[PDB]
Ligand binder design. Structure first.
Ligand SMILES: CCCCCCCCCCCC
Ligand SMILES: [Cl-]
Length: 162
């Protein structure tokens, strides 16, 4: 089924700081496909609004350059589910976080997958944390994932992990 899991007691102020998209998966190969694929987003930093929203700073090569983006994940009465806003009010879900090393999150539509779902495994260091990746895969046995990208240290310290 669909993001059957979340974080109990998400101290959104403690996910503040810099993050490395260490790995990312999706329900549809086209999502993570090519380099320009829509949801091949590289998370730079999570900025929690004092009100309690979530400002995400991400990079995404659009026209031909590693472009830097910035979207705002607003708060809901569920502590660990945030909305973004487009023509299609997708939402962000934070599966799990130990606050210092890893943060597993997912972002979901509203209109079913197969159609839309993408989860990432964020680490704070540009290392390869096998155990974060184990918690990733564990958390995503449950899910309709069809593609799974994984990056290397060298790659992490580049823009759009080139
Ligand atoms: C703009 C396309 C959706 C990108 C949203 C990713 C935001 C990262 C969320 C991190 C949650 C802790
Ligand atoms: Cl509400």
């Amino acid at each position: 089924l669909i993001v059957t899991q979340t974080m109990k007691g998400l101290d959104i102020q403690k996910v503040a700081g810099t993050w490395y998209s260490l790995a990312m998966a999706a329900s549809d190969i086209s999502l993570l496909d090519a380099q320009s694929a829509p949801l091949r987003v590289y998370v730079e930093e999570l900025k929690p609004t004092p009100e309690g929203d979530l400002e995400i700073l991400l990079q995404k090569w659009e026209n031909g350059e590693c472009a830097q983006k910035k979207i705002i994940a607003e708060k809901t009465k569920i502590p660990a589910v945030f909305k973004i806003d487009a023509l299609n009010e997708n939402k962000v879900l934070v599966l799990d976080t130990d606050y210092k090393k890893y943060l597993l999150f997912c972002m979901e539509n509203s209109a079913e997958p197969e159609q839309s779902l993408a989860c990432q495994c964020l680490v704070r260091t540009p290392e390869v944390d096998d155990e974060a990746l184990e918690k990733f895969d564990k958390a995503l046995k449950a899910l309709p994932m069809h593609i799974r990208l994984s990056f290397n240290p060298t790659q992490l310290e580049e823009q759009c992990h080139i």
